[PDB]
Each structure stands twice: as C-alpha cells, then as structure tokens.
Amino acid sequence: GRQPFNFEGLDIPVYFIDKPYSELELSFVNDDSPLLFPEMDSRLPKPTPELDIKYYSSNLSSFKEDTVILMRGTTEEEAWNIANYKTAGGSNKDLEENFILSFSEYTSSINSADTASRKHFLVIIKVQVKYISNDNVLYANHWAIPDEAPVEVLAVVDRRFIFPEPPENVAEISSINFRRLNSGNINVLKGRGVFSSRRLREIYLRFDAANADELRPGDVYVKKTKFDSMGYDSHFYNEGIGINGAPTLNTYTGEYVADSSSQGATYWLKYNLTNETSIIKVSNSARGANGIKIALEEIEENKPVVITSGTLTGCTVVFARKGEYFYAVHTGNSESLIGFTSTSGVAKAIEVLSSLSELEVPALPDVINNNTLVEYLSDNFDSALISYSSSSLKPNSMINISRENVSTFSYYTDDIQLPSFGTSVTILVRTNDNTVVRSLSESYTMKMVVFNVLQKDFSA
Ligand SMILES: [Cl-]
Numbered sequence: 412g413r414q415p416f417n418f419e420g421l422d423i424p425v426y427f428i429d430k431p432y433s434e435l436e437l438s439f440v441n442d443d444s445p446l447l448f449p450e451m452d453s454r455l456p457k458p459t460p461e462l463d464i465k466y467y468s469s470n471l472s473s474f475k476e477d478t479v480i481l482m483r484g485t486t487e488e489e490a491w492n493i494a495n496y497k498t499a500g501g502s503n504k505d506l507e508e509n510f511i512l513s514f515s516e517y518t519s520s521i522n523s524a525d526t527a528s529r530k531h532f533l534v535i536i537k538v539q540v541k542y543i544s545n546d547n548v549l550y551a552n553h554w555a556i557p558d559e560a561p562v563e564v565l566a567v568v569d570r571r572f573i574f575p576e577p578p579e580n581v582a583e584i585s586s587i588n589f590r591r592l593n594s595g596n597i598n599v600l601k602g603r604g605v606f607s608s609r610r611l612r613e614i615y616l617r618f619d620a621a622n623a624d625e626l627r628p629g630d631v632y633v634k635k636t637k638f639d640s641m642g643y644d645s646h647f648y649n650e651g652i653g654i655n656g657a658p659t660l661n662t663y664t665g666e667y668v669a670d671s672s673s674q675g676a677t678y679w680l681k682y683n684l685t686n687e688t689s690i691i692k693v694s695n696s697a698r699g700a701n702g703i704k705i706a707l708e709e710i711e712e713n714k715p716v717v718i719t720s721g722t723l724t725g726c727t728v729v730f731a732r733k734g735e736y737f738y739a740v741h742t743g744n745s746e747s748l749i750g751f752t753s754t755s756g757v758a759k760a761i762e763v764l765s766s767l768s769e770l771e772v773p774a775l776p777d778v779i780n781n782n783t784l785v786e787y788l789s790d791n792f793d794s795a796l797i798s799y800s801s802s803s804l805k806p807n808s809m810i811n812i813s814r815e816n817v818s819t820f821s822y823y824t825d826d827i828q829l830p831s832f833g834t835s836v837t838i839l840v841r842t843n844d845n846t847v848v849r850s851l852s853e854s855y856t857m858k859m860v861v862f863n864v865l866q867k868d869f870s871a
Pocket residue numbers: 526611612613639640
C-alpha cells in the first residue's frame with residue numbers, strides 16, 4: 412500500500428483519532444461520529460461565524476491583520492502537509508514565488524466540515540483575513556486561501572474510522588419504522604409531524620436538480636452530478652436563513668430524520684428510519700423554485716428514498732410523474748413577499764419543471780397564478796399533486812379549476828385556526844419488483860396533530 416503518515420513529530424495542539432458511533436442508539440453506525448453534530452466536540456476550537464468573516468473581509472483595511480478560525484475536510488496526506496509546512500495548501504513554496512495562484516478552500520460551516528471530513532481528516536486552522544476570499548467559491552460558507560499562505564494549525568482529527576467491523580427502544584422502533592417504509596407503506600410517515608435536516612450525506616441515488624431564483628435572472632441552474640461531500644452548492648443554499656444560512660436542497664441518511672433546524676418537528680427528533688434510508692430535502696429558493704427529477708428505475712431494493720419539503724407555511728410543493736420519472740418542486744420565497752408565491756413562484760416552478768422535463772417553456776398567460784400551475788401540470792405531466800396555501804383574501808392563491816390528472820391540497824385555508832403548518836412528502840420504494848411511489852400531504856393544528864390529509868399514489 413502507501414506508507415501511513417506519522418503525525419507525532421508535527422506541531423499540532425489537538426490531534427486524535429475519532430471514534431464512530433459503533434465504538435462509543437446508533438451502535439451499528441461505524442462510518443460516522445458525533446464529533447461535529449449536533450454539538451462540536453469540546454476538544455475542538457470553534458470556527459468564526461460566517462457573518463463575522465464576511466464582516467472582516469468586507470472591511471479589509473480595518474481587519475486585514477486579524478484572524479479567523481476555519482475548518483476543512485482533507486485526505487491524510489493533505490492534512491499532514493498542512494500541519495508540516497504550516498501553509499493553507501500544504502505547500503512549501505514561498506508566497507513570493509507566485510510573483511516571479513493555487514488555492515485551497517476552507518469553510519466556516521460545521522455541517523460542511525462534518526460532511527467533508529467524515530471517513531477522512533478534519534483540519535482546523537487560524538488564518539489572517541488578508542489571505543482569504545470567497546469571490547469564486549462554488550460552495551456555501553467557503554473561503555479560498557492561497558496554497559502558500561501561512562496558517563496556524565489548531566487541530567487535526569483522523570476520522571477514517573479504522574475499527575474492526577461491528578458483529579427507550581429508539582433503535583428497535585426505528586428498525587420497525589424502516590421495515591414499514593421498506594414495505595412501501597406510507598403510513599409510517601402519517602401524523603408524526605414534519606421532518607427536515609441540514610445534514611449533508613451523499614446518497615446512492617443520482618438525480619437531476621434545478622434552481623430558478625430572482626437573484627439570478629435569465630437562467631435555470633441545473634445540477635446533474637451527485638450531491639456529495641465537497642460542500643453545499645451555493646445555488647441550493649440561502650444565506651439569509653438564520654445566521655450562517657441554510658441549504659435549500661440537500662440529501663442525508665435516515666439515522667437522523669429531523670434535527671433542531673426543523674421547525675415544529677416532534678416524533679422525528681426522537682426516532683429515525685436508520686441509515687439505510689435516503690432522504691432528499693427540497694425547500695423553496697430564496698425567491699423561486701428548487702426541483703428534482705428521479706428515474707424510477709434507479710430506486711434500489713432495500714434502499715428506500717424519502718422526499719421531504721419541511722415545514723410549509725405559505726410555499727407550494729408539487730409532486731408529479733411523467734413516464735418513468737418522478738418530479739418534486741418546491742417554490743416560494745424566504746423574503747416575506749406578499750403575493751409572490753402564487754404568481755412569480757408559479758413562474759419559477761414552471762421554469763424548473765420545463766427545464767427538468769427537457770421542454771421549452773410553453774406560452775403562458777399575462778397573469779400567472781395557481782390556476783396556471785394546475786393547467787401547466789395537467790397538460791405536460793401524467794399526474795400531479797399541488798400542496799399550497801390559499802386565502803380568499805389573496806385571489807391569486809385560490810384554485811377554482813380542476814383537472815382530472817391534478818390533485819390539489821390547500822394545507823392552509825382561512826378556515827384554519829393558527830398556529831398551523833403543512834407537510835408534503837413522498838416515498839419511493841423498490842419492492843415486489845416495482846417502484847412504489849406514494850405522496851402524502853398533511854395539515855397540522857393546535858402539541859400539533861394532523862386533521863386534514865391528501866394521499867396520492869403515483870405508481871401502477
Ligand atoms: Cl457523504
């Protein structure tokens with residue numbers, strides 16, 4: 412093989428070997444650990460908040476000499492070279508040699524560092540602001556640093572989890588939940604509340620993903636590569652959510668179904684679907700739509716897939732089938748734009764649906780509203796479900812037509828006593844030699860309980 416790198420002679424204040432869950436409820440998860448999630452291990456220095464880094468970098472004359480703390484997932488060899496040469500890219504060339512630029516990207520996102528370092532190495536550095544920039548990064552919360560820039564290495568953690576394979580009833584109930592899902596029974600997700608996570612884990616399934624947002628006029632962004640451990644694609648990220656921002660489209664595995672970012676979650680904070688379940692979270696874009704297209708023949712036996720839209724409080728979720736492909740689109744806005752979702756949001760959803768289905772956008776009326784979405788879906792897809800919020804006060808939100816191939820679920824109406832929220836989810840399961848596809852939309856009221864539902868099957 413290749414000689415193991417020996418870190419003992421290096422200048423590393425904090426160096427240790429990370430233990431996976433299986434070596435410490437998740438006693439069978441041998442390729443992940445709680446090092447960074449949900450709480451960053453107390454041995455590790457914490458990164459500088461993204462907003463503070465942006466503040467320093469935006470006032471460079473005032474803070475060029477000050478430092479920030481950043482994280483990175485790297486290989487064994489990269490981590491050793493960073494710690495040995497004390498430069499951002501593990502280079503021993505002098506910075507001056509560039510002026511007679513190669514860059515490495517670090518992150519302020521704990522979840523991003525978790526994703527990148529799992530099964531590899533975590534490196535934490537302190538670096539002066541004059542060496543960082545984010546002008547050309549593709550991933551959220553990333554900062555490029557010249558490979559030759561000096562850094563102070565604060566921690567290196569070996570997260571390769573090289574350990575002999577493992578030979579309140581949370582584990583047992585979660586295994587039953589997996590068996591229920593894996594049978595193709597949508598009832599496992601009924602009534603147990605909303606779920607979402609900001610975690611990023613690559614799942615087995617590749618799918619087309621698209622984004623249309625008013626921040627980027629004149630373009631629909633299309634991603635056909637896997638959602639992988641490099642980080643959070645900035646097109647599927649919303650810097651305005653909370654403090655460090657949040658992803659608007661991410662995949663994770665079912666050992667965590669909801670985390671503390673899921674507004675209103677209950678049952679799925681406690682129990683899970685095991686890490687054999689693959690979950691795709693599709694949220695709205697800041698001012699527009701995110702969508703995915705799944706090839707039903709690529710769902711694999713004993714690897715069920717769950718799509719969740721998170722907590723619905725005004726946004727529109729579309730599930731649809733055309734041929735051998737399933738579509739999920741979530742449109743709306745995070746900027747409290749009254750009337751956007753039932754008008755511009757519909758237009759953005761149609762842009763995404765047309766892009767994913769490889770159709771030219773059809774001719775649309777001058778006034779685009781939720782009825783327009785019903786018509787578009789009816790004419791261009793085999794079957795569809797719209798889950799949406801309507802009020803007699805906002806006429807554009809009201810759906811007053813019907814099409815035989817389009818179901819609609821108003822998870823909010825004026826008849827609802829707040830507080831309330833909606834959910835909309837789909838399961839895709841290869842069982843009995845076919846791909847079962849079942850969708851479920853719910854309204855929750857009041858401890859929140861479901862009082863209104865629509866269940867739609869998209870399989871034969
Ligand atoms: Cl991953």
